[PDB]
């Protein structure tokens, strides 16, 4: 069960042409990047297994990003019109598209969605035959797209090419992509007073990002301060859960950790 | 690879 996604962002900067940014992911691994603000804008690798691609790959992708950027400039002009916004405002057009594959490597689902100024705009439905428009401006886009039979056009990449590239990347990156890193776990103790302490359960250097951390007191779930999962910076992730406890009762508390990389769930205690 | 395909909103 794997996935590929491209995320595009165009941002208008009246007085300063729009900026275009692309990132690509396979699962939780960013692999490619493009930034129109760069010294000499080009697609660049961001994961080891993509570095083997020849110059033709980089050149082609670079030219795609440049052409997309120009279309987005035009799309931004249309959107400004649809919403009767003035020529002073900075605005944001976002695109996310790609494919999901099941364990058999076959297409599970395609994705193709857009947002204007942080809010849903238009999205291709799961059937890959119809659109959902978020408002009446989006319906202008919707009608034009229906007239052009846009969803049928999108099927070629979403159902074909997308899955082929995902499969190439899975094979080139087998080591890192098909294998999970289990969390390095441990529990820390932090006195608040002579009467109260924090127990914190750490999960460090795991991949992928999906993880479960729960605290139990005498086996009873304590639903805990839970932080949002954060990047370690080396393509692994980190997260922690903490519970405040009366001093001397630490021994009653256990942290339960669940992760794809663990043969079995882990239970830890402050000792 | 990104889709070789361009559109306009």
């Amino acid at each position: 069960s794997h996935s590929m996604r491209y995320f595009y962002t165009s941002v208008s900067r009246p007085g300063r042409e729009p900026r275009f940014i692309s990132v690509g992911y396979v699962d939780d691994t960013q692999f490619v990047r493009f930034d129109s603000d760069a010294a000499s804008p080009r697609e660049e690798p961001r994961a080891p297994w993509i570095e083997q691609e020849g110059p033709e790959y980089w050149d082609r992708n670079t030219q795609i990003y440049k052409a997309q950027a120009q279309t987005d400039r035009e799309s931004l002009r249309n959107l400004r019109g649809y919403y009767n916004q003035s020529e002073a405002g900075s605005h944001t057009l976002q695109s996310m598209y790609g494919c999901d594959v099941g364990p058999d490597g076959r297409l599970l689902r395609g994705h193709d969605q857009y947002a204007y100024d942080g809010k849903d705009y238009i999205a291709l439905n799961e059937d890959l035959r119809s659109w959902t428009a978020a408002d009446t401006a989006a319906q202008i886009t919707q009608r034009k797209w229906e007239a052009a039979r846009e969803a049928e056009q999108r099927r070629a990449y979403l159902e074909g090419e997308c899955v082929e590239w995902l499969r190439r990347y899975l094979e080139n990156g087998k080591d890192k992509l098909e294998r999970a890193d289990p969390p390095k776990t441990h529990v820390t103790h932090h006195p608040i007073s002579d009467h109260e302490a924090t127990l914190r359960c750490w999960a460090l250097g795991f991949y992928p990002a999906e993880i479960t951390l729960t605290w139990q007191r005498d086996g009873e779930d304590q639903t805990t301060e839970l932080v949002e999962t954060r990047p370690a910076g080396d393509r692994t992730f980190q997260k922690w859960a903490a519970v405040v406890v009366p001093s001397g009762e630490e021994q009653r508390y256990t942290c339960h950790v669940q992760h794809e990389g663990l043969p079995k769930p882990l239970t830890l205690r402050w000792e | 690879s990104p889709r070789w395909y361009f559109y306009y909103l």
């Epitope: 033709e56 790959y57 082609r60 030219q63 795609i64 052409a67 120009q70 279309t71 035009e74 052009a148 846009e150 056009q153 999108r154 099927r155 070629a156 990449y157 159902e159 074909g160 090419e161 082929e164 590239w165 | 690879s1 889709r3 070789w4 395909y5 361009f6 559109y7 306009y8």
Partner: T-cell receptor
Framework: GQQVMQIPQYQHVQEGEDFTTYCNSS?????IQWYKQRPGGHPVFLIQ?????EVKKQKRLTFQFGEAKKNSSLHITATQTTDVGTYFC???????????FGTGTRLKVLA | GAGVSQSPRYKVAKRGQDVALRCDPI?????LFWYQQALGQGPEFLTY????????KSGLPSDRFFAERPEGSVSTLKIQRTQQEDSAVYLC??????????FGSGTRLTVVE
């Protein structure tokens, strides 16, 4: 490296009889497209297929894409005189900027 | 416009003379292609433009053939010092990359002695 071949070269069929044209690619395709060129005109797109083994029906036309994505057929049931012209296929391979057209099958419908 | 425009529709050239064929793609189409189609035969790829950039010139048969698209709209295919073998239909197509691939009616070029 790549060749896109179409057979047969031509076909004279009796009105109401069936016509089939076959498209072969030496390399694996991403997707395949079919075009009709009315006599004295140019190729105009009929349909595109993407999935291995896909079958699409478009009026009297049936289009088929092989399991290995190297072969496709266009079939007309009950040909009419109005179906006269050359039918062309075109392959697309990911990574390129090119539509590669077959050699075409000319359909002549005897009334 | 809403369709691909090509001019002239028909051209007679004296062997050894230069010709210029014009193509005007669908409004807003990023992609432009030139194809050559001999009488009774299929289109063969010549060259491809993404906006003004000629990203694939691999089908051009010799140096005598060169295309331009200076403003990323109108394209001109130039054939220098025409030979008999150059007689064909030249088809222009425009697209949004993979999407919306559409041909014009072509320029019918006959090179005569």
């Amino acid at each position: 490296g790549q060749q896109v071949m179409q057979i047969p070269q031509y076909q004279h069929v009796q009105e109401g009889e069936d016509f089939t044209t076959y498209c072969n690619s030496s390399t694996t395709l991403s997707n395949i497209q079919w075009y009709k060129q009315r006599p004295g005109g140019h190729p105009v797109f009929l349909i595109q297929l993407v999935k291995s083994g896909e079958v699409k029906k478009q009026k009297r036309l049936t289009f088929q894409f092989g399991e290995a994505k190297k072969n496709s057929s266009l079939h007309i049931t009950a040909t009419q005189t109005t179906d006269v012209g050359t039918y062309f296929c075109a392959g697309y391979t990911s990574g390129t900027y090119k539509y590669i057209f077959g050699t075409g099958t000319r359909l002549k419908v005897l009334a | 416009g809403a369709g691909v425009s090509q001019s002239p529709r028909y051209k007679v050239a004296k062997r050894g003379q230069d010709v210029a064929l014009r193509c005007d793609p669908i409004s807003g189409h990023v992609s432009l292609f030139w194809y050559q189609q001999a009488l009774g035969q299929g289109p063969e790829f010549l060259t491809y433009f993404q906006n003004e950039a000629q990203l694939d010139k691999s089908g051009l048969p010799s140096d005598r053939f060169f295309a331009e698209r200076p403003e990323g709209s109108v394209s001109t295919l130039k054939i220098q010092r025409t030979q008999q073998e150059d007689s064909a239909v030249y088809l222009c197509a425009s697209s949004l990359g993979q999407g919306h691939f559409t041909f014009g009616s072509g320029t019918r070029l006959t090179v005569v002695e």
